[PDB]
Amino acid sequence: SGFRKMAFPSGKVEGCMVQVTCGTTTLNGLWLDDVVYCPRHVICTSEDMLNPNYEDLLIRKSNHNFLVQAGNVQLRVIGHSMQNCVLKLKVDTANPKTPKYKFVRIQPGQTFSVLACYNGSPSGVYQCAMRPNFTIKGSFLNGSCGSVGFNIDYDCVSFCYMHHMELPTGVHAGTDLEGNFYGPFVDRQTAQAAGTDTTITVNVLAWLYAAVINGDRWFLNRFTTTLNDFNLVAMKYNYEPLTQDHVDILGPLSAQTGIAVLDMCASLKELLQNGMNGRTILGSALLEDEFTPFDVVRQCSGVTF
Amino acid sequence: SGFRKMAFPSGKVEGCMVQVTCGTTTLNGLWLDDVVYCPRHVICTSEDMLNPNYEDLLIRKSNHNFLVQAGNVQLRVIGHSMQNCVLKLKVDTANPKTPKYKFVRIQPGQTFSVLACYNGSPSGVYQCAMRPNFTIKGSFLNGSCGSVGFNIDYDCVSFCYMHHMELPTGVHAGTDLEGNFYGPFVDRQTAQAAGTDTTITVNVLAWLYAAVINGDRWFLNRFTTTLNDFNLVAMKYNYEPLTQDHVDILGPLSAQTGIAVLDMCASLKELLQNGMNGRTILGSALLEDEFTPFDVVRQCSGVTF
Numbered sequence: 001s002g003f004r005k006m007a008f009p010s011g012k013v014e015g016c017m018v019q020v021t022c023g024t025t026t027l028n029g030l031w032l033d034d035v036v037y038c039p040r041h042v043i044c045t046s047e048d049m050l051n052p053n054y055e056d057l058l059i060r061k062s063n064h065n066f067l068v069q070a071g072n073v074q075l076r077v078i079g080h081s082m083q084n085c086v087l088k089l090k091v092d093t094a095n096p097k098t099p100k101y102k103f104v105r106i107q108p109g110q111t112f113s114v115l116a117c118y119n120g121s122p123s124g125v126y127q128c129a130m131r132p133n134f135t136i137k138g139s140f141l142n143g144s145c146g147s148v149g150f151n152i153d154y155d156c157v158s159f160c161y162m163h164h165m166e167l168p169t170g171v172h173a174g175t176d177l178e179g180n181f182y183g184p185f186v187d188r189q190t191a192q193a194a195g196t197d198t199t200i201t202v203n204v205l206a207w208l209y210a211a212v213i214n215g216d217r218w219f220l221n222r223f224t225t226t227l228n229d230f231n232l233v234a235m236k237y238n239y240e241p242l243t244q245d246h247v248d249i250l251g252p253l254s255a256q257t258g259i260a261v262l263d264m265c266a267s268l269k270e271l272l273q274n275g276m277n278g279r280t281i282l283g284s285a286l287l288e289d290e291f292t293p294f295d296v297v298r299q300c301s302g303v304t305f
Numbered sequence: 306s307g308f309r310k311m312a313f314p315s316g317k318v319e320g321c322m323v324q325v326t327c328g329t330t331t332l333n334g335l336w337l338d339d340v341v342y343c344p345r346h347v348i349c350t351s352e353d354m355l356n357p358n359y360e361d362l363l364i365r366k367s368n369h370n371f372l373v374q375a376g377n378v379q380l381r382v383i384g385h386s387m388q389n390c391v392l393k394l395k396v397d398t399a400n401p402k403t404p405k406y407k408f409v410r411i412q413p414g415q416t417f418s419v420l421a422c423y424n425g426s427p428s429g430v431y432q433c434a435m436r437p438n439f440t441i442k443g444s445f446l447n448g449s450c451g452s453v454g455f456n457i458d459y460d461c462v463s464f465c466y467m468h469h470m471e472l473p474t475g476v477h478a479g480t481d482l483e484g485n486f487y488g489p490f491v492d493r494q495t496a497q498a499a500g501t502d503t504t505i506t507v508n509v510l511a512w513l514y515a516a517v518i519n520g521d522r523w524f525l526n527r528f529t530t531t532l533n534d535f536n537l538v539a540m541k542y543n544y545e546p547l548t549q550d551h552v553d554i555l556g557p558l559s560a561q562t563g564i565a566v567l568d569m570c571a572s573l574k575e576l577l578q579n580g581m582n583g584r585t586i587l588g589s590a591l592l593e594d595e596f597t598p599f600d601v602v603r604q605c606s607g608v609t610f
Contacts, residue, residue, distance in 0.1 A: 001475050004444040006429030009420065011316025115314065121609035124311030125430060137588070139309040141607045170306050170520060215475060278580075283442070285590030302446045304426035 003210050003282050005290065006299060007113035007127040008152045015097030018075070019120030020089070020146065021067040028117045028146030029068060029089070030162070030177075032098050036068055036075070036089040037177060038146045039164050040082055041187050049189040058082055063089075069120060070095070084179030085164065085187050099157045103177040106160040108132045109200040109240070111292050112149040114161070119143060129203070129290040130161075132240060133195040134183025135171040138163070149174075152305050167192055200289040201239045202246040205264055207288045209253035210296045211281050218279060220259070223266040230265040237272045249293045308515050308587050310595065311604060312418035312432040313457045320402030323380070324425030325394070325451065326372040333422045333451030334373060334394070335467070335482075337403050341373055341380070341394040342482060343451045344469050345387055346492050354494040363387055368394075374425060375400070389484030390469065390492050404462045408482040411465040413437045414505040414545070416597050417454040419466070424448060434508070434595040435466075437545060438500040439488025440476040443468070454479075457610050472497055505594040506544045507551040510569055512593045514558035515601045516586050523584060525564070528571040535570040542577045554598045 020029040020038045023045065029038035041049065043057045061080070066089050068075040079090035106112065111129045115122050116139060128136055128149075140147065140163055149161030164174045164187055171194060173185040185192055212220065231241045247261045254261050268287075276285060325334040325343045328350065334343035346354065348362045366385070371394050373380040384395035411417065416434045420427050421444060433441055433454075445452065445468055454466030469479045469492055476499060478490040490497055517525065536546045552566045559566050573592075581590060 001446070001471065002442060002444040002477065004429075004431040004433070005310065006421065006431045006444060007312060009316070009319050009427040009430055010314045011319040011427075014314050014316040116311065118607045118609045122314040122316075123607060123609045124309075124604070125314055126309040126311045128309070137307060139307040139311060139604060141306070141605075143607060166306065172307065275583075280591065286585065299429070299444060300446075302423045302428060302448060304423045304428045 001214050003214050003299065005127050007125045008150065009305065010113065010115045010122065010125045012099040012152065012157050013115045013148065013150055014122050015099070016095060017115070017117050017120050017122055018068055018070045021069075022061060022065055026119060027143060028120055030146070030148055030159070031068075031070055031075070031091070031095040032101060034091050034094045036077075036091055037086050037162065038089070039162065039175075039187065040085050040087045040179070041145070041164065042087065051188055051190075054082065058087075071120075082179075085175050085181060086162065086177070086179030100155050101157040101159060104151075104158045104160050105176040105178075105180070106130055108134060109203065109292070111290060111295055112151050112160050114138055114149045114163075115147060116140065116144055117147045127290065129200065130182065131197050132200065133197040134181075134185075135167070135173055135194050135197070136161070138172045140166060140172055148177075154305060167194065169194065196238075199237070199239045199287070201234055201242050201268075202249060202293065203289040203291055204239070204268060204287050205242075205246075205250055205261070206253060206293040206296045207282065207291045208264055208267060209250070209257055209259070210291065210300065212257050212259065213300055214282065216281050219267050219271055219281065221267055221270055223270065224260070224263050225266040225269055226262065227265075230262070230269055233269045233272055239272070252297055253293060306519050308519050308604065310432050312430045313455065314610065315418065315420045315427065315430045317404040317457065317462050318420045318453065318455055319427050320404070321400060322420070322422050322425050322427055323373055323375045326374075327366060327370055331424060332448060333425055335451070335453055335464070336373075336375055336380070336396070336400040337406060339396050339399045341382075341396055342391050342467065343394070344467065344480075344492065345390050345392045345484070346450070346469065347392065356493055356495075359387065359492075363392075376425075387484075390480050390486060391467065391482070391484030405460050406462040406464060409456075409463045409465050410481040410483075410485070411435055413439060414508065414597070416595060416600055417456050417465050419443055419454045419468075420452060421445065421449055422452045432595065434505065435487065436502050437505065438502040439486075439490075440472070440478055440499050440502070441466070443477045445471060445477055453482075459610060472499065474499065501543075504542070504544045504592070506539055506547050506573075507554060507598065508594040508596055509544070509573060509592050510547075510551075510555055510566070511558060511598040511601045512587065512596045513569055513572060514555070514562055514564070515596065515605065517562050517564065518605055519587065521586050524572050524576055524586065526572055526575055528575065529565070529568050530571040530574055531567065532570075535567070535574055538574045538577055544577070557602055558598060
């Protein structure tokens with residue numbers, strides 16, 4: 001037993017990480033088949049990032065200007081193109097370590113693992129959630145751009161995020177692997193409002209179920225509630241409204257524990273209105289929203305890859 | 306910027322994980338060079354674990370009774386021996402994916418990454434600390450035994466933990482890779498007292514420095530303290546006593562931030578005596594002790610492998 005904020009094993013992604021250098025800028029690329037993907041801002045100088053004309057900047061570059069190194073092996077670049085905010089560098093060798101993979105655009109409130117990298121070399125791995133406002137709260141230093149987020153199902157890596165920028169607020173923004181930003185963000189060094197964020201209610205409920213499964217149950221009570229009543233409380237506390245689709249996704253956890261979803265909502269209602277009373281749940285003194293229902297089922301059932 | 310509880314990239318360890326079956330029991334093994342390491346309790350039935358005679362049980366087994374599979378390839382077992390609480394199965398093929406590695410016995414209060422595995426297949430990765438009382442608070446289900454803990458420095462994997470058992474309290478115990486348990490624990494299904502635990506003070510202080518580096522600084526104050534005075538408070542709150550060796554290890558973080566260690570101790574003293582006042586630090590509502598000073602330096606400087 002026990003419940004930890006676990007990331008997927010990162011080896012299948014580690015084998016895809018490369019370094020990309022254009023001019024004086026170095027960041028990370030992702031090498032899959034005979035294409036390397038990376039943020040298009042690799043082509044900017046520090047002066048360009050205030051309002052770059054990416055089309056004009058890219059025109060001044062040729063294939064031989066993109067230096068791509070996988071470990072200590074240099075790749076030969078035979079074409080380049082910009083797709084939204086990503087560059088795609090065609091190379092003459094397919095990556096022998098390419099895993100089965102796909103590109104997915106994830107929904108807010110879903111989770112994924114990030115492999116943080118610098119100069120093409122992996123540094124560490126951690127799990128996180130796409131916030132309702134399409135930012136992530138990661139750990140990204142200068143040179144981490146191009147690090148990717150992913151999920152793994154069976155033998156297939158679903159790539160969902162590439163890191164592009166740190167907002168002045170210290171939160172992080174990036175794109176899917178087609179180069180479309182999540183959220184309203186653009187790849188230029190300007191102040192950019194992130195929307196109002198909310199707490200991911202269905203994830204909090206999943207984590208409360210995870211707690212009960214593991215023996216933390218002091219928060220269970222004699223009360224119940226209704227979807228309407230609970231959503232009045234969710235609104236007061238800046239939680240996402242709960243829908244029947246959310247209740248349905250929680251069905252397997254409700255069945256396993258025997259705790260009806262609306263009964264668990266009444267536990268959550270009381271925790272929101274009264275706090276935790278100096279107590280903890282699964283080692284946390286606040287309500288955790290970075291585990292999805294699937295994450296809970298997966299971890300408590302021991303799925304592997 | 307940003308600060309996350311990051312694990313090392315796990316790919317170098319993933320390539321070493323195998324399944325070991327003896328009789329009806331299946332768990333995980335670690336394949337390095339031409340040796341597979343796994344918990345010796347693979348040779349027990351469910352009835353044996355109350356007080357197994359491991360010497361007698363092992364005598365009834367021969368090389369061909371240990372079924373070892375790396376992915377879908379079967380390994381040929383050419384010898385077996387017990388070292389403390391681990392079995393070492395010599396196989397006729399050296400693992401082509403063996404990383405540069407060493408075996409280390411870590412000290413309480415140090416951290417490491419765990420690759421949780423089932424049936425030889427990796428499931429997830431997470432970071433954790435060896436508690437002062439030589440237990441770990443992990444995520445381990447039935448079949449996870451033989452999963453390993455490790456650190457990586459440059460290109461060298463230092464293996465430090467193999468998982469053996471869940472105590473009736475729900476905390477976890479295991480061995481170094483020579484099969485010596487951390488703590489007083491034995492590999493038999495009996496109630497076993499874990500010692501009194503404490504909070505790892507030097508790690509809390511490191512994390513407070515990490516917070517200041519990242520912009521969380523509301524807890525800094527106008528006070529200072531002495532090692533003696535702070536240790537009176539540490540004793541009241543069940544924190545490890547702080548020593549000059551600990552102060553010395555915190556030197557680089559003190560230099561970077563300009564905050565003298567004893568000044569940060571005065572911040573910690575106030576947090577212990579007064580709580581967090583409904584506030585958070587690096588996304589946490591309690592004082593975090595699972596980051597060492599080295600972990601903080603590493604993450605804030607972007608070291609890679």
